[PDB]
Scaffold this active site. Structure first.
Site, PDB file in Angstrom:
ATOM      1  CG  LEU A  15      -2.076  -1.022   1.284  1.00  0.00           C
ATOM      2  CD1 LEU A  15      -2.657  -1.061   2.688  1.00  0.00           C
ATOM      3  CD2 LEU A  15      -3.172  -0.749   0.256  1.00  0.00           C
ATOM      4  N   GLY A  16       1.836   1.314   0.909  1.00  0.00           N
ATOM      5  CA  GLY A  16       2.701   2.480   1.084  1.00  0.00           C
ATOM      6  C   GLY A  16       3.586   2.341   2.309  1.00  0.00           C
ATOM      7  CB  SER A  17       6.781   3.025   3.222  1.00  0.00           C
ATOM      8  OG  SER A  17       7.225   4.014   2.310  1.00  0.00           O
ATOM      9  CG  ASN A  19       7.569   8.777  10.287  1.00  0.00           C
ATOM     10  OD1 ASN A  19       8.149   9.649   9.634  1.00  0.00           O
ATOM     11  ND2 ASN A  19       6.437   9.007  10.949  1.00  0.00           N
ATOM     12  CG  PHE A  20      10.389   3.872  11.884  1.00  0.00           C
ATOM     13  CD1 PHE A  20      11.760   4.085  11.723  1.00  0.00           C
ATOM     14  CD2 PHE A  20       9.678   4.704  12.749  1.00  0.00           C
ATOM     15  CE1 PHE A  20      12.412   5.113  12.405  1.00  0.00           C
ATOM     16  CE2 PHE A  20      10.321   5.737  13.439  1.00  0.00           C
ATOM     17  CZ  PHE A  20      11.691   5.942  13.266  1.00  0.00           C
ATOM     18  N   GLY A  21       9.134   1.127   8.270  1.00  0.00           N
ATOM     19  CA  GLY A  21       8.450  -0.031   7.697  1.00  0.00           C
ATOM     20  C   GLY A  21       7.555   0.253   6.502  1.00  0.00           C
ATOM     21  CB  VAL A  23       1.340  -0.023   5.406  1.00  0.00           C
ATOM     22  CG1 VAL A  23      -0.055  -0.498   5.802  1.00  0.00           C
ATOM     23  CG2 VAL A  23       1.979   0.735   6.566  1.00  0.00           C
ATOM     24  CE  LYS A  40       4.296   2.188   9.855  1.00  0.00           C
ATOM     25  NZ  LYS A  40       4.204   3.275  10.867  1.00  0.00           N
ATOM     26  CG  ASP A 126       5.382  12.539  10.440  1.00  0.00           C
ATOM     27  OD1 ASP A 126       5.571  13.584   9.774  1.00  0.00           O
ATOM     28  OD2 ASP A 126       5.532  11.398   9.963  1.00  0.00           O
TER      29      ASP A 126
END
Ligand SMILES: CC(C)NC(=O)c1c[nH]c2ncc(-c3nn(C)c4cc(Cl)ccc34)nc12
Length: 267
Positions: A15-17, A19-21, A23, A40, A126
């Site tokens: 799907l997307g990313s 700050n960390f990892g 998804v 995630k 964020d």
């Protein structure tokens, strides 16, 4: 809190990313039903995901993405509620005929989630349109707690690549992050929303943003944005932290203007 791997099925697509990892879409076999989830996936990176999970665990609010749990398999996994329509910035980029009333509704829902976070003494750190997820066209949730901090019982601020274009002067100058700094960030988020997912401070580097702000200058009113909403943005961008409003006052302003537009829509 800990989940069963065999009850969890992942798609091979991403799907997307955050700050960390990264998804991915998944499915979790609940007590009776199957729940579509966002998952995630990923030494130091492990601890930040666990800290993120720890933060989400404590949060209970309709306008915040809830954590379903965590699972250790091929990698550490953070299983969360699915918001099918995705990130607010991308949605508005792709759906330009979304009405201003609808935008007001969505940013108000964000302010309700943030009022709760402030009341819970957590700082998001964020807060941007990319981290507001749409369950429906009329239902927003705040996500990505990768940089979030639980404030100490004796302190009103957390002392620390940064999303500089969303950061208040005190974050830049003193590395100090509070709910008021989240309020500043919320103003940039509003600007993004009313600009239909346009990037703030277009074509400028961090240092040029700093020079602009110290000249007392702020981004202009987006085309078609109501003056009342632009005024609120500007108030969020109050330089001095003490004179900047908290989310309680921000939410009330948004709540009142929304009902005003709703009831005038009947006229
Ligand atoms: C990554 C971080 C913010 N996302 C999350 O923490 C999420 C938590 N629940 C979610 N549900 C859907 C999406 C999502 N759906 N679509 C269609 C996306 C497209 C992109 Cl590019 C990114 C996320 C999503 N992302 C999340």
């Amino acid at each position: 809190v800990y989940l069963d791997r065999k009850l969890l099925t992942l798609e091979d697509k991403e799907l997307g990313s955050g700050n960390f990892g990264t998804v991915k879409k998944g499915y979790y076999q609940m007590k009776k039903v199957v729940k579509t989830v966002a998952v995630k996936i990923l030494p130091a990176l492990k601890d930040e995901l666990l800290a993120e999970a720890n933060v989400m665990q404590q949060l209970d609010n309709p306008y915040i993405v809830r954590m379903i749990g965590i699972c250790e398999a091929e990698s550490w996994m953070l299983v969360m509620e699915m918001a099918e329509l995705g990130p607010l910035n991308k949605y508005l980029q792709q759906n330009r005929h979304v009405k201003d009333k609808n935008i007001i509704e969505l940013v108000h829902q964000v302010s309700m989630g943030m009022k709760y976070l402030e009341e819970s003494n957590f700082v998001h750190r964020d807060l941007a349109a990319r981290n507001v997820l749409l369950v429906t066209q009329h239902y927003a949730k705040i996500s990505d707690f990768g940089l979030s901090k639980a404030l100490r019982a004796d302190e009103n601020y957390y002392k620390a690549k940064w999303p500089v274009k969303w950061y208040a002067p005190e974050c830049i100058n003193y590395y100090k992050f509070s709910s008021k700094s989240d309020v500043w960030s919320f103003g940039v988020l509003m600007w993004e929303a009313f600009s239909y997912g346009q990037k703030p401070y277009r074509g400028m580097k961090g240092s040029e943003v700093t020079a602009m702000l110290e000249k007392g200058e702020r981004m202009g009113c987006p085309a078609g944005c109501p003056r009342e909403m632009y005024d609120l943005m500007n108030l969020c961008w109050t330089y001095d932290v003490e004179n900047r409003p908290g989310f309680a006052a921000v939410e009330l302003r948004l709540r009142n203007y929304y009902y005003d537009v709703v009831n005038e829509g009947h006229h």
